[PDB]
Amino acid sequence: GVDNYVIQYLKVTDTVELPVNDRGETKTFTAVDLTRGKRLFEENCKNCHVGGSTLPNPLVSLSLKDLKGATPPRDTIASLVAFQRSPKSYDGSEESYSCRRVSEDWLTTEQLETLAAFILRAAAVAPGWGV
Amino acid sequence: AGVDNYVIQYLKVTDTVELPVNDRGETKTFTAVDLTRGKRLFEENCKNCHVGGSTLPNPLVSLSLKDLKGATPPRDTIASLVAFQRSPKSYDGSEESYSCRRVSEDWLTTEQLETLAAFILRAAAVAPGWGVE
Ligand code: HEC
Ligand code: HEC
Ligand SMILES: [Cl-]
């Protein structure tokens, strides 16, 4: 059903509101959404981003501090989604081939939004994330 | 949850299977439960780069049986895959690789890594599409 990590570490039991853009819009995500997103993160991302780290480039982690230091900041659903569709360097000036680009054939919009939600929520509230 | 369907239907192992344990013709007996455990370890630790037997960051060095057997020395036995994972090497074996995931004994025990090697080895042999990407 719902993952206990989402219960325990993300502190979500029903729903949660997350920033979609820099404009002021939010989107509601359920606990099952964040559970699905956690699973997608395990299948596609965790091997390089264990615990919110970035093993092949420790300065550019998935911590909220590091996401907010990116150009543009990677602290919203829309900016995280846009990033995975075409990964970029930290200053955003060059294409990066070190992280995993995800096509719409691989993850649909809905799926990638759950992944971004899991990462954004974990960045905001999970103990130890990005350490 | 005891034996996963993928192992029955795609690895074609219901009871046991015999896999090359070393280069001198010796095999070791793995059960369907062993391969299920190895699959789970692969899904948890290796799948971002090696989904379906591919190698996303270097597709020329995949988990296909062809590519495994062409490594130096060949990576087509339990012992050779375990030794690889403990300290990953380049394809010709002359240099240390930092592009794959080294697995310390603190991460996976000998037996666990054996079951992961067995999963990869059986998949390479019989799983439809494995490594052909
Ligand atoms: C290893 C091969 C990786 C996998 C698999 C995934 N990512 Fe990654 N990511 C990786 C590196 C080496 C980097 C640094 C990139 C650079 O060129 O600077 C990243 C970066 C990110 C970031 C940006 C973090 C920041 O502080 O700005 C994000 C948000 C990110 N990665 C997400 C991500 C997701 C969701 C993945 C699963 C689909 C994923 N990455 C896979 C290395 C690797
Ligand atoms: C991405 C970050 C990887 C993860 C996670 C794992 N592997 Fe890997 N592997 C990766 C690369 C880029 C390469 C090519 C290496 C080179 O220097 O030539 C490999 C290679 C292997 C091999 C050898 C394949 C061959 O044809 O000889 C094996 C057996 C292998 N990888 C297994 C493996 C396992 C079991 C992992 C999970 C524990 C794993 N890899 C993670 C990239 C990445
Ligand atoms: Cl891993």
Side-chain angles (χ1 to χ4, degrees), chain A residues 1-130, chain B residues 1-132:
Chain A
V2 162
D3 191 307
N4 195 75
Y5 182 88
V6 172
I7 298 299
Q8 181 152 337
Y9 287 86
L10 302 191
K11 297 301 293 291
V12 180
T13 297
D14 249 338
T15 57
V16 65
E17 296 177 89
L18 294 181
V20 166
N21 47 43
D22 38 19
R23 297 180 52 87
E25 269 65 56
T26 66
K27 189 164 173 281
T28 286
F29 290 88
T30 71
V32 79
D33 285 324
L34 292 177
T35 287
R36 175 182 319 187
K38 177 165 177 283
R39 188 136 180 276
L40 291 179
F41 179 83
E42 297 173 335
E43 302 197 12
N44 294 281
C45 323
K46 189 183 175 169
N47 301 165
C48 294
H49 292 290
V50 283
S53 67
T54 301
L55 301 180
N57 188 353
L59 267 63
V60 184
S61 83
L62 303 195
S63 73
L64 198 58
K65 198 173 225 299
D66 286 348
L67 291 168
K68 285 176 173 277
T71 306
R74 295 171 183 155
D75 58 345
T76 47
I77 306 298
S79 64
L80 281 171
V81 166
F83 177 88
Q84 226 56 52
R85 295 299 187 206
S86 213
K88 306 301 208 72
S89 63
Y90 195 58
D91 54 25
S93 61
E94 286 108 6
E95 299 97 6
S96 172
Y97 304 105
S98 311
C99 179
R100 167 85 180 127
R101 185 185 77 93
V102 181
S103 65
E104 286 187 84
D105 296 337
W106 193 261
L107 297 189
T108 70
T109 303
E110 149 177 290
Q111 290 187 298
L112 190 47
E113 282 188 306
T114 72
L115 180 42
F118 168 81
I119 294 168
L120 200 47
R121 184 57 175 186
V125 315
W129 180 265
Chain B
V3 179
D4 286 21
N5 185 69
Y6 178 86
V7 169
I8 303 303
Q9 178 182 353
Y10 292 132
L11 295 190
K12 297 156 202 153
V13 175
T14 292
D15 296 33
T16 62
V17 66
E18 298 289 330
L19 298 167
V21 80
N22 59 33
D23 45 24
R24 63 185 161 279
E26 297 174 339
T27 62
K28 172 155 167 33
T29 309
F30 291 89
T31 66
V33 170
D34 291 326
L35 298 161
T36 294
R37 286 188 198 172
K39 170 187 179 65
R40 182 156 317 259
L41 287 172
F42 178 88
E43 294 178 321
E44 303 304 347
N45 295 292
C46 316
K47 197 170 167 172
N48 301 180
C49 296
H50 289 297
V51 70
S54 74
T55 296
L56 295 192
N58 180 16
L60 178 277
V61 181
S62 77
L63 310 182
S64 67
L65 191 58
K66 162 179 181 182
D67 285 355
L68 292 169
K69 294 190 98 82
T72 298
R75 296 177 184 154
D76 60 358
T77 63
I78 301 303
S80 57
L81 284 168
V82 170
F84 175 81
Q85 222 58 49
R86 288 295 187 218
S87 186
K89 299 284 177 284
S90 61
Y91 195 66
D92 75 340
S94 66
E95 191 55 36
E96 308 275 9
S97 166
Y98 313 90
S99 303
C100 184
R101 181 48 164 267
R102 202 147 183 168
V103 177
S104 83
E105 290 193 65
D106 314 278
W107 192 272
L108 294 175
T109 67
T110 307
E111 289 99 328
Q112 283 175 307
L113 210 59
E114 281 173 359
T115 69
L116 169 56
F119 171 78
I120 290 169
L121 198 42
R122 181 58 168 187
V126 309
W130 180 273
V132 186

